[PDB]
């Protein structure tokens, strides 16, 4: 086996996430290339093509067949330490591995923060709007 929270570091686990991914043979954003890129497929009905970096948590939709998932990665999240990782997983040192996994747990915290802040501004807008309607 292998601890379940470390799976996303494994290319094959990532590939495995692509359920009804539409871009297959002939396309440049195949499940395979996506996984190589660090993406995991996390589809909702509202956006069935939603892919997310397991490391930086940056979320990307509106995929088109010619999209090279790696360039899209560099483009929409230039600072993702995964991109820098040039070794295969098992060539990584455990120290290196734990460094990476540390940054990822922090990226995760940043992300939740950024979310909470967005939810906060959202509810504020509602409040301000309701208040104007009252004023």
């Amino acid at each position: 086996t292998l601890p379940p929270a470390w799976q996303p570091f494994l290319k094959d686990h990532r590939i495995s996430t692509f359920k009804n991914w539409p871009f297959l043979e002939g396309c440049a954003c195949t499940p395979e290339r996506m996984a190589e890129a660090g993406f995991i497929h996390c589809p909702t009905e509202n956006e069935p093509d939603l892919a997310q970096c397991f490391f930086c948590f940056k979320e990307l939709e509106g995929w088109e067949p010619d999209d090279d998932p790696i360039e899209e990665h560099k483009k929409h999240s230039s600072g993702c330490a995964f991109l820098s990782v040039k070794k295969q997983f098992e060539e990584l040192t455990l120290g290196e591995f734990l460094k990476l996994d540390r940054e990822r747990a922090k990226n995760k915290i940043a992300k939740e923060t950024n979310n909470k802040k967005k939810e906060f501004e959202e509810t504020a807008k509602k409040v301000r709007r309701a208040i104007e309607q009252l004023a």
Partner: peptide
């Protein structure tokens, strides 16, 4: 591809 919603 583009940043989410």
């Amino acid at each position: 591809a583009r940043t989410k919603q």
